[PDB]
Each structure stands twice: as structure tokens, then as C-alpha cells.
Amino acid sequence: GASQFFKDNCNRTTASLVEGVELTKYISDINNNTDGMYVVSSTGGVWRISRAKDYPDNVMTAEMRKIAMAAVLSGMRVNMCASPASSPNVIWAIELEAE
Amino acid sequence: GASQFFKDNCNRTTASLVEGVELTKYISDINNNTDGMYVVSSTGGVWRISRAKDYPDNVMTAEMRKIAMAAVLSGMRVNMCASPASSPNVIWAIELEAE
Amino acid sequence: GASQFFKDNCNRTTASLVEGVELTKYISDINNNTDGMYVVSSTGGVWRISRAKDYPDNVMTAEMRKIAMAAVLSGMRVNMCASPASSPNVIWAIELEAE
Amino acid sequence: GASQFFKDNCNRTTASLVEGVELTKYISDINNNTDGMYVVSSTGGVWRISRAKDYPDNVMTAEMRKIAMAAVLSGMRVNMCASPASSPNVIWAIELEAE
Amino acid sequence: GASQFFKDNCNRTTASLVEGVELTKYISDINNNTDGMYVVSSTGGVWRISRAKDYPDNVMTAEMRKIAMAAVLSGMRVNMCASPASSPNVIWAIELEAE
């Protein structure tokens, strides 16, 4: 499951830890209100992947997307640290796992 | 099939929902009139992939090209939310599905 | 073979169409007289992939590069629309095909 | 094991050499205090991938992430030159191996 | 073996042609004097791939990094046009070959 490192970093914020998720859908949407990138788990949960224009978050967010797409393609599980303050919940950190 | 979330976001628009599309061709064309990115389906269907220079749509459009190609390479299915206004229809949201 | 859509766009131009090409070499060169990106087929034909710096062509040419490298790495045939008004002939449109 | 070249380079620095690492986790985090890119090995070790905004280090930093993500995806081991001072240690150079 | 085109092109220069090289290591280093992107063949040979900030060289050197990483990842061979003007030698042109 999540690395202690990951668990610990997450338990330090207001986000919630989601472990061993299997994403089966990857979404790109430029429609006015739904504008964004989302992922869907094999149990129907939906998450919004964070987006940033400025350095450095523009980097990590770009990596969150690669990680996300990689998971959908390979069937690799991921561990998330998502904030439940928005709907869909937004991903603040993501861990791809090969194991 | 398309995710409930995906459907939800598409129906609220004037675009039509296309499900379980098997993409077999990916095209990049720079000739004056057909200037664009397109994807053809196993059924002959053809869509144009939206283009954008500014943030943040430049991000989603880039993820759209990544998803399509991926579909072509992996023979993985996609659900689209496309505008029947243009010829070929333009992609406004797309969903890559593992299952 | 080449999608009808693909065939039609090529025909409206000065260029010509080449189908079912197996690309076996991908080339990057920065030499003074031959700097460029090229691909070579199983038969020994060579083409230059077009290049550009400004939007929106830089986007499409980048996609041409991606398509060419994917073909070489996976052995997936491509259909091209290339101008014989240069040597080697320049690619103006390219279609990646799984089917 | 590390190439003589890689080893020799790592030895001119205050950094230390780690060989044949098997990375199993790739992390993207945008949280206030944890913001950053990290990898975790099969043994439980954690390393932060360096970041840079300006040329040309933004290029190297970019390859490092790719090298890192590639290892996690394909399972190939990496040799790193990391600063043993910080926690997690910071990677300054990385070498991907196949053989 | 190298394409006639690639050979012709390299024989136009002062550099040397190196055919059928198996790349086994790929390096990214930001350390001061050793910063650069390097490739190591299965016989211990080392070459440097240059970095260019400006167009069009930022495009070509970027693809060289992709070919390099790819050759290392898939086991595919490459033919190089390399200059002894530096140590390690710089790659002026590179050809990924599936043939």
C-alpha cells in the first residue's frame, strides 16, 4: 500500500488518504463548466487532477497527469491524498506503484 | 461504457455523446486548408481534435492528443462528447477507458 | 490503407500520396548542411518531417515526430502526403494506422 | 553496476553513490510542505528528484523524472549520485541501465 | 546498418560514423562540470548529446534524447555521427534503427 513517506505527508494536511485505487478512465474536458482532467476508479469514484500555470506546481501537476495516464494504461494502482472540500475531490499528491 | 460523470457533463451541453469508439487512425496535417489533428474510427468516423494556444485549454488539448494516440496504439476504447456543428465533428471532451 | 478523409485532403494539394509505408529508421541531425528530422522506409525511401516554431504548426509537426517514432518502434505502417518539390520529399500530412 | 564514467563523476562530489536501485514508487506532491517529486525503492528508501526553473538545468531535471518514471514502469534499476545530507536524499545525477 | 542517407550525410562532415551500437545506460546529471546527457554502449563507450536552448536545435537535441532513451529501453540499435572534438565525443546526428 501507500509508502510510509506518502502516508505521513498526507496525514499532515486536510486531505484524505485513498489507497490502492484502480483507475479505469482518464478524462480531458474543455467544455465550459466541466473544464479539466479527471480520473475514474473501478468503483466509480471520480477525482479532479490539479492544474497550475506557474512553476513549480506546473511541473508536479504535469507529472500527476503522466502518473494518472500510466495507471489507466498499465493497470497499476495508485495512492491518493485528495481534498474532500470540492466535488470532484481534487488530488494533492499521487503515488504510482509498481511493487 | 461512458462514466456516469462523463455522460452527466456531456448531456448538459449541445454536443452529442459517442460511446465505445475504436480509433484506428491518427492524423497530423499541416496543409493550408485541412490544417489540423484528426482521428478516424474503425467505422470511418472522423473527428477533429481541438487546438488551443493559451492556458489552460492548451493543457487539455494536449492531453486529448495524448489520449487519442494512446487509443490508436493500444486499441483501447474512448467515449467522446463532440460538437456536430463542424465537419468533421470537433472533440470537446474525451474519455479513455481501460474497461 | 489511407482513410478516405486522408486521401481527399492530399488530392487537393500539389503533393502526392504514399500508402502502407513501413518506417525502419528515425533520424535526428544537427549538422550545418543537413540539420533536420527524417525517416527511412524498409525500401530505402527517405522523407523529411516538417518543422516549425510558431503556433499552430509547431503542434502538428511535433505530432508528426511522435507518429514517426511510434511507427518505427512498433512497426505500424503510415500513410503520407509528401511534396516531391524537395529532396528528400517533405511530409505535409501523415496518418498513423492500426487498421 | 554504475559505469566508470558515472562512478568517476559521482566521486568528484560531496555526494554518494547508490547502485542497482529498484524503484517501485513514483510520487507527485503539491502540498505546501512536501511539494516535490520523489521515488521510493523496493527496500523503502526515498529520494527527492531535483527541480530547476531555468535553462539548462530544467532540461536535466526533466530527464531525471523521465528516467525515474521509466524505471518504475519497466522495473529497470538505476544508479544514483545523491546527497546523503538531506532527508530524503536528493538525487543529483542518475543513470538508467538495461543489461 | 546505417542508411546510405545517414552515411552520406556523416561523410559530408568531419565527424565519424559508428554503426550498430547497443546503448545500455542513459545519464542525466546537473552537477557543475559534469552536467549533461550521456549514453553508454555495451562496450563502455560514452557519448554526449548536446543541449540547445534555441530553435531549431532545441527540437533536434530533444529528439536525440528520445531516441537515446528509447534505444536503451527497447534494446534497439543506433548509428551515430560523432565528433572527436570533445570528450566524451558529441553526437552530431543519430539514427534509431528498427532494421
Three-class SS string for chain A? CCCHHHHHHHCCCCCEEEEEECEEEEEEECCCCCCEEEEEECCCCEEEECCCCCCCHHHHHHHHHHHHHHHHHHCCEEEEEEECCCCCEEEEEEEEECC
Q: Are B98 and A25 in contact (CB under 8 A)?
A: yes
How many CB contacts within 8 angstroms connect chain D with chain E? 85
Q: How far is C27 from chain E (nearest CA, A)?
A: 5
Answer whether B40's CB lies under 8 Å from B28's CB.
no
CA-nearest residue to C62 within chain E is: E59
User: Please, how many CA atoms are within 13 Å of residue C55, restricted to the half-sphere of its CB?
Assistant: 5
- The answer to whether A46 and A52 have CB atoms below 8 angstroms apart is no
Q: Which of A3, A57, A70 sits opposite D73 (nearest CB)?
A: A70
Which residue type, as a one-letter code, is found at position C46?
Answer: V
By C-alpha distance, which of D5, D49, B26 is closest to C97?
A: B26
Largest interatomic CA distance in chain E: 39
C-alpha dihedral, E52 to B59 to B32 to E53, nearest 10° = -10
Q: Can you tell me the distance from the alpha carbon of B13 to that of B9, in angstroms, rounded to the nearest whole number?
A: 7
Compute the distance between CA of residue E8 and CA of residue E12 in angstroms, rounded to an integer. 6
d(CA B91, CA B66): 13
Q: Which three cell numbers stand for residue D78?
A: 538505476
Interface test with D, best of A12, A63, A77, A83 (most D CBs within 10 A): A63
Q: Which residue has the cell 511530409?
A: C91
Contacts 24+ apart (CB under 8 A), E18-22: E18/E79, E18/E80, E18/E81, E18/E82, E19/E79, E20/E77, E20/E79, E21/E45, E21/E77, E21/E78, E21/E79, E21/E80, E22/E75, E22/E77
Contacts A–D by Cβ distance under 8 A: 89
The separation between CA E29 and the C-alpha centre of its own chain, rounded to angstroms, equals: 16
Show the beta-strand stretches assigned E in chain E.
Answer: 16-21, 23-29, 36-41, 46-49, 78-83, 89-97
What's E76-96 look like in SS3?
Answer: CCEEEEEECCCCCEEEEEEEE
3-class DSSP state for residue C86?
coil
Burial of B53 (0-12, 13-18, 19+ CB in 10 A): exposed
Integer Cα distance of E35 and D57 in angstroms: 8
Q: Nearest to residue B3, comparing CAs of A88, A45, A31, A89?
A: A45
Q: Tell me phi and psi for residue A33, to 5 degrees.
A: -90, -30
Helix (H) or strand (E) holding D75: none
In whole angstroms, what is the distance from residue E79 CA to residue E97 CA?
8
Neighbours of chain C (3+ CB pairs under 8 A): B, E
Question: Cell for D14?
Answer: 560531496
Angle at E72 between CA D49 and CA C35, to 5 degrees: 95
Provide the b/e sequence for B13-37 (b: ≥16 CB within 10 Å).
Answer: bebebbbebbbbbbbbbbbeebebb
Q: Name, in order, each residue with C-beta under 8 angstroms of A45's C-beta and a sequence gap of 6 or more.
A: A18, A21, A89
Residue B43: what are its φ and ψ, rounded to 5°?
-95, 0
| Chains contacting chain B through 3 or more C-beta pairs under 8 A | A, C
Q: What single letter denotes the amino acid at residue E78?
A: V
Of B57, B64, B72, the C-alpha closest to B22 is: B72
Cβ neighbors of E86 (< 8 A, separation 6 or more) are: E48
Q: List CB contacts of A98: < 8 A, sequence separation 6 or more.
A: A76, D23, D24, D25, D72, D73, D75
Residue C56 parent element (H or E): none
CA dist., res. B72 & res. C45, Å (int): 25
Interchain proximity D92–E31, CB inside 8 Å: yes
Cell of E67: 531516441
| Type of residue at C6 | F
End-to-end CA distance of chain A: 9
Query: Does the beta carbon of D31 lie under 8 angstroms from any beta carbon of chain A?
Result: yes
B82 touches chain A (CB under 8 A): no
Q: Residues of A with CB below 8 A from D88's CB?
A: 5
The CA distance from B59 to B38, in Å, is 18
Closest CA to C64 of B86, E59, B90, A29: E59
Q: Considering only alpha carbons, which residue of chain E is nearest residue C65?
A: E63
Q: Cell for B8? A: 452527466
Which approach determined this entry? X-ray
Q: Where are the domains of chain C?
A: 1-99
In this structure, the number of other CB atoms found within 10 A of the CB of residue D1 comes to 11
* DSSP-based three-state secondary structure for B81: strand
For domain B1-99, which CATH number applies: 3.90.1150.10, 2.40.30.10, 3.90.420.10, 2.40.50.50?
2.40.50.50
- Dist. CA E21–CA E39, nearest whole Å: 11
By Cβ distance, the residue of B30, B44, B69 closest to C50 is B30
* Resolution of the structure, angstroms: 2.2
Q: What is the distance between the alpha carbons of residues C5 and A47, in angstroms, rounded to a whole number?
A: 36
The closest CB to that of D9, out of E29, E51, E75, belongs to E29
CB contact at 8 A, A29 and D47: no
Whether C93 sits inside 8 A of B34 (CB atoms) is yes
